[PDB]
Structure formats: C-alpha cells, structure tokens
Amino acid sequence: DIVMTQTPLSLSVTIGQPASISCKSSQSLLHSNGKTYLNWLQQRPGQAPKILMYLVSKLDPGIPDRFSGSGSETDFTLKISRVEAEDLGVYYCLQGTYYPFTFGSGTKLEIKRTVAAPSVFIFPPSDEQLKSGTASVVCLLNNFYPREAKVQWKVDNALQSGNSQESVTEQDSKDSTYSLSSTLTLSKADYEKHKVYACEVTHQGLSSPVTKSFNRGEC
Amino acid sequence: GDRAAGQPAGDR
Amino acid sequence: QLQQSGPELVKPGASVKISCKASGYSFTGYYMHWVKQSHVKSLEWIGRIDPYDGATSYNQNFKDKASLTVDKSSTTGFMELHSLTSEDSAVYYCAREGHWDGDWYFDVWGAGTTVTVSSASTKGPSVFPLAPSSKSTSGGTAALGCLVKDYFPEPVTVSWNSGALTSGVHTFPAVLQSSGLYSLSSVVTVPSSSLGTQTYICNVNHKPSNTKVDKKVEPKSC
C-alpha cells in the first residue's frame, strides 16, 4: 500500500501566525480519471477525526477559509492562515487513489500562547479512603503555559521519590493552557507516621518555587 | 445518487 | 448522525460485535467505513459495506479478522472481530462517505468504540472526594474534584451534576499504577463563596463493569 510521510511530527504555532504541514506519498496519487484523492483530517483530543479538505484543495463547507491545501501528485501541503486556539489536535493525510486507504503518521499541533503561571492546590486524603488503608495526596496545577513543569513532594521537609505519579491534561481548546495533577500514594501506616505534607512547584512563569502545605489533623 | 459511490481506494 | 456501542472488554481468543446506529440520512445511499486507531499515530482503514445490498469490501489485513454486516430494518451497521489478540486493542470508528460538490469524503464520524483485549477481568472503580479547603483556594476561587481509583479497563466516564457543570472542568488522562489498575482525577474551579449554596456531585460511569457512582463533594475544615 501507499506509504504517507508527514513532516514535521510535532509543531508549535502562535495564535494568529501561519502554519504549514507536509505530506509525501510513495507513488503519484493521480488517478486514471485525473483526480488526486488526498484528504486532510483533524482530530481534536477526545473527539473523532474530521475531514478538513478533500481533493487537495476543496474545503468542507463547515471549515473556515483560513485552512488551505496545495499539493502536486506526490507532495502535499496543508496551510493555516492564522492559527486559532480551536485548531489544536493531530492532523492526518489520507490518500484515496489506490486501494486500500492509508493514513499518515500524524502531526501534533500545539497552540503557542503567552506564559501563564499555574494555580497550585492541594487536597488532603479523604477519610473514606483512610478507612480502606491507603492515602492519596493530590497536588493540582491549573491553567498554566507552557506545559513544562516540575513538581516535587516533601514530607516533613524530606524530599520524596518513587511514590508519586503525575498526569497532564491535553491543551485547552479555549485558553490553550494545561493542567497537571500529582498524586502521592501511601499506606495508612506510612501516612500516619508524619505530619507535614507539601508539594513544591517550579514553572517558567514563576520566579521562585511555590509551596502548598498542610498538617495532618487540621481537618 | 441513489446507489452509493466513493473514492477509488474503497474498492479494488 | 452516527452512534456507536459502548466500550468492550474481551478475553484473548474471544469475539466482539460493535454496532453503528445511523440516523438522519438515506442509509442505503452512502458507504459506511470502519477505521482502527491503535494509538495516536496509528490510523488504519478496515473496510466498507454498501447498505443497499450488503456488498462488503475489506482491507487485506482484516480479511480473517473483521466481517461487516448490515441491518436495513434498524439502519444499523455491525462489525464483528474474530479471534482477538493483544494487537487488536484499539478504538474503532465508523464513518459515512458523504457527497458534496460532486466529490466523496468522510463527512460524518462515529464517536468511537474502545476495545480492550485482556485476560484480566473488569474491576469497578473507587470514587473518593477531593474536598475543597483553605489549602485549595486561590484568589476567591476554590478547587474540588473526585479521585477515581483502581478500575480496569479504560475508559471511565466522569461528569459533574449530570452534565450541567462543564465550565472549568478538567478530567485528567488516567495513569497506570503498579497494580496494573488505572486511576484518574476530575477537577473543577468554582467560586469559594458558592461552596455553601451550590452542590457539586461527580458522576462516575464505568461501563465495562456496569458501575455508576455519584459522589457529593462537600467542603472540609482543613
């Protein structure tokens, strides 16, 4: 089958600035009837794919005019005039000339916005979970950019390692920011051994590390 | 188009 | 215009049947294709079926794996997968090849069906409240949420107030724990003054285990 190669693999564009995605096919996608069946798809996180363009340059009526497509028989380019926040997600090219259909590798598009400092929250473990025998302490970073952030746990001013997990959201379709949760999991025995639990947050938008802390028993 | 049609990659 | 079936947990070697309910258009007038998504970069075409007479065209990779049938009475298309292996765990979409400007393309896509192939059995999640407090306040805004822990497989559906609370909601991608069970959290930022008047309930629905849980998240003194 035809092999589609998409360059670049990831792309980061500022709002209002142009973007460009490339797609190359192993064979000429021109068909006997003279039509070049190339399709561009966009898949926002948590949604199904949606076709942006068909036959290289024809836009779907629901797609705005800032999307454009220009390509020859073997090389193709998808252009965005002014990138907006809703244009995030992964873009795939799809050939429809030769059986069977084949997709490209995909190009992740990140929306570049101004630096935003995270809001730091901390949640002591619930009493219902403490009755089960485990204790999860959550540290929350909300609405920051860029996504590069560092979280470190301190139990009684002692740096921890090997007992926490963290997860970052996808980029927001509206404000183009990220959120991050960090869960520190311990046993009921290990949790009651200490009193001071804190998470230290370092981010590009912060001058000094921010520390949210609590004492076991404040509740 | 009562009968379905599509891009040539669907059928051989 | 396209509705798919729920997520499925299948043991290795067994079979699975997922459906694609169509509505709002001439069912027999457009091909219905199926697509496999193994991960973020893997997108593969399975095959198509003509709803008028049942003519099916398959990809050579899915000859012995997939079989497409149709039901004109219910205007529903089905895909059955036989002898599943680990590499069959993916998300499966159904799509319509529509017509516009004298050209054909996929203009309607289903939401997708998550299929997990594993010998492990399903496990219901445990929901714990992330109660707001002084430690979760920032500039008159408060944070609260729900911790969904120890479930298998993916996905779990989290909503707030039966879907009425959506603004400011962040549901995190699940993490794999050392026990092999998934865990995630859903959080929302609300006005701290509205903690006494408003009621915040997270709705956790884990379809592979048929587990529906509602948790009221109330403030705490901390």
Side-chain angles (χ1 to χ4, degrees), chain A residues 2-219, chain B, chain C residues 2-222:
Chain A
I2 307 295
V3 177
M4 319 293 292
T5 306
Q6 305 193 203
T7 56
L9 296 181
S10 62
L11 188 57
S12 180
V13 184
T14 322
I15 309 189
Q17 300 303 313
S20 183
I21 295 180
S22 295
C23 177
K24 178 167 187 53
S25 62
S26 57
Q27 199 196 2
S28 164
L29 295 187
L30 190 62
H31 195 256
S32 179
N33 47 29
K35 297 185 172 183
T36 305
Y37 295 91
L38 183 101
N39 309 276
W40 283 102
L41 291 79
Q42 176 193 27
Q43 187 181 25
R44 299 182 187 91
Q47 292 189 12
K50 174 191 58 181
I51 285 194
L52 301 181
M53 320 193 66
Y54 58 96
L55 290 194
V56 178
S57 296
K58 284 197 170 184
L59 280 171
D60 183 287
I63 305 306
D65 301 14
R66 58 175 180 271
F67 290 86
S68 56
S70 55
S72 73
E73 300 180 3
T74 64
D75 307 338
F76 307 88
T77 301
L78 170 65
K79 292 188 176 68
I80 304 178
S81 308
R82 299 169 183 172
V83 168
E84 299 192 3
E86 59 175 347
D87 295 334
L88 37 62
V90 184
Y91 294 75
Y92 309 85
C93 46
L94 165 66
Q95 66 92 23
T97 298
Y98 294 113
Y99 163 86
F101 289 96
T102 41
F103 295 86
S105 295
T107 297
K108 183 179 179 184
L109 171 57
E110 181 194 18
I111 310 302
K112 247 174 184 178
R113 57 147 298 162
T114 64
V115 178
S119 301
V120 186
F121 312 94
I122 187 165
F123 301 93
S126 63
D127 295 359
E128 185 182 12
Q129 186 189 13
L130 293 174
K131 298 176 179 181
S132 65
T134 58
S136 296
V137 186
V138 184
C139 186
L140 175 59
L141 282 63
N142 201 35
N143 304 338
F144 60 93
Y145 188 88
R147 55 182 300 191
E148 287 76 23
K150 297 184 177 182
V151 187
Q152 284 191 347
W153 288 92
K154 282 191 175 182
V155 179
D156 299 355
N157 286 12
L159 180 64
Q160 298 297 322
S161 55
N163 47 20
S164 66
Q165 297 186 284
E166 71 182 9
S167 174
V168 62
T169 59
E170 70 292 334
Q171 199 178 18
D172 195 311
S173 63
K174 304 177 182 180
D175 51 67
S176 295
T177 65
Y178 298 86
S179 297
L180 185 145
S181 66
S182 186
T183 306
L184 174 66
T185 313
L186 293 175
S187 67
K188 181 186 177 182
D190 293 356
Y191 177 69
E192 291 183 324
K193 292 173 186 169
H194 311 78
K195 188 172 183 178
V196 178
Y197 293 85
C199 54
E200 170 179 347
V201 175
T202 299
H203 184 258
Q204 172 173 344
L206 299 168
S207 61
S208 53
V210 182
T211 299
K212 278 282 175 173
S213 58
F214 72 94
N215 297 333
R216 179 179 55 93
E218 285 174 356
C219 297
Chain B
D2 285 350
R3 291 308 304 264
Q7 305 182 22
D11 194 4
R12 192 169 176 89
Chain C
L2 283 182
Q3 192 74 13
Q4 298 192 212
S5 62
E8 305 290 339
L9 173 60
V10 185
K11 289 185 178 178
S15 298
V16 68
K17 188 176 184 179
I18 61 186
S19 60
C20 183
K21 169 64 179 182
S23 299
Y25 67 95
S26 309
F27 182 58
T28 55
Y30 306 101
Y31 288 108
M32 169 175 41
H33 302 248
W34 290 81
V35 172
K36 177 181 175 186
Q37 182 167 40
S38 297
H39 50 79
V40 183
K41 300 198 68 184
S42 179
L43 218 51
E44 324 166 35
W45 178 71
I46 298 175
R48 72 174 192 187
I49 175 175
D50 195 333
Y52 184 77
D53 51 8
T56 62
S57 183
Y58 297 97
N59 183 12
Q60 233 71 19
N61 304 339
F62 306 93
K63 276 293 187 179
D64 299 3
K65 183 66 59 177
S67 64
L68 303 180
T69 61
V70 80
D71 182 16
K72 298 185 298 182
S73 311
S74 59
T75 70
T76 299
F78 302 87
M79 180 176 69
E80 186 174 353
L81 306 166
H82 311 276
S83 299
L84 294 186
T85 59
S86 64
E87 298 197 25
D88 290 314
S89 285
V91 180
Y92 297 89
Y93 299 97
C94 56
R96 179 192 75 175
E97 196 161 15
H99 193 190
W100 178 266
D101 199 3
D103 292 313
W104 300 87
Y105 66 93
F106 308 104
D107 57 352
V108 183
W109 284 72
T113 297
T114 300
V115 175
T116 300
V117 178
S118 174
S119 62
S121 64
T122 182
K123 186 176 184 304
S126 302
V127 185
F128 301 114
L130 298 177
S133 61
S134 66
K135 306 305 182 177
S136 66
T137 51
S138 182
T141 73
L144 57 93
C146 283
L147 177 59
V148 184
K149 199 185 183 63
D150 304 332
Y151 69 93
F152 180 84
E154 291 250 53
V156 74
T157 303
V158 181
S159 71
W160 286 89
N161 296 341
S162 305
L165 180 49
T166 54
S167 181
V169 176
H170 294 284
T171 305
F172 290 85
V175 296
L176 188 57
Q177 294 177 131
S178 288
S179 61
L181 307 175
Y182 298 103
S183 290
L184 60 76
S185 296
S186 182
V187 294
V188 60
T189 43
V190 302
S192 63
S193 50
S194 302
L195 291 180
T197 55
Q198 309 310 123
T199 295
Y200 302 106
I201 297 168
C202 70
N203 312 119
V204 185
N205 179 25
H206 186 222
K207 300 172 198 63
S209 63
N210 191 20
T211 296
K212 292 185 179 65
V213 175
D214 295 325
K215 258 291 187 307
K216 185 177 181 183
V217 184
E218 300 178 32
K220 183 56 183 182
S221 305
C222 267

